[PDB]
Amino acid sequence: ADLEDNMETLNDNLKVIEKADNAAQVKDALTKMRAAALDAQKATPPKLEDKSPDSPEMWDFRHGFDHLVGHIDDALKLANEGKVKEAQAAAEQLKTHCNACHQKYR
């Protein structure tokens, strides 16, 4: 999957998590979100295509997904213990990091 597909996976599973009814639905959504974020991390955003792959902007873009994965992992620990409401709250707090990267590179 390319970068925009990974981003659509993140956006879709976000809406899934807030509409979810049980911990299984939340755990499956977070697992796909983890893979999409790690896959997106290997991509180059169109706005940075004329920058070097080694540029500080590209490393900042990659580091943003490291932090996002950390939050998905923390939310995964909550969903694995049946705490769907806590997991839904954690998944809602991803949005501040979604927006912060987008303001720079989207």
CA distance 31 to 19: 16
CB 87 within 8 A of CB 78: yes
User: Closer CB to Cl ion, residue 33 or residue 78?
Assistant: 78
Which of 7, 10, 40, 84 contacts Cl ion by CB under 5 A?
84
- ∠ CA(31), CA(71), CA(65), 5° rounding? 85
Examine residue 51 and tell whether it contacts ligand HEC (CB under 6 A).
no
Query: Any binding-site annotation on 33?
Result: no
CB 40 within 8 A of CB 65: yes
Examine residue 102 and tell whether it contacts Ca ion (CB under 5 A).
no
Binding region for ligand HEC (CB under 6 A):
3-4, 7-8, 10-11, 14, 45-46, 61, 64-65, 68, 94, 97-98, 101-102, 105-106
Binding residues for heme b: 7, 102
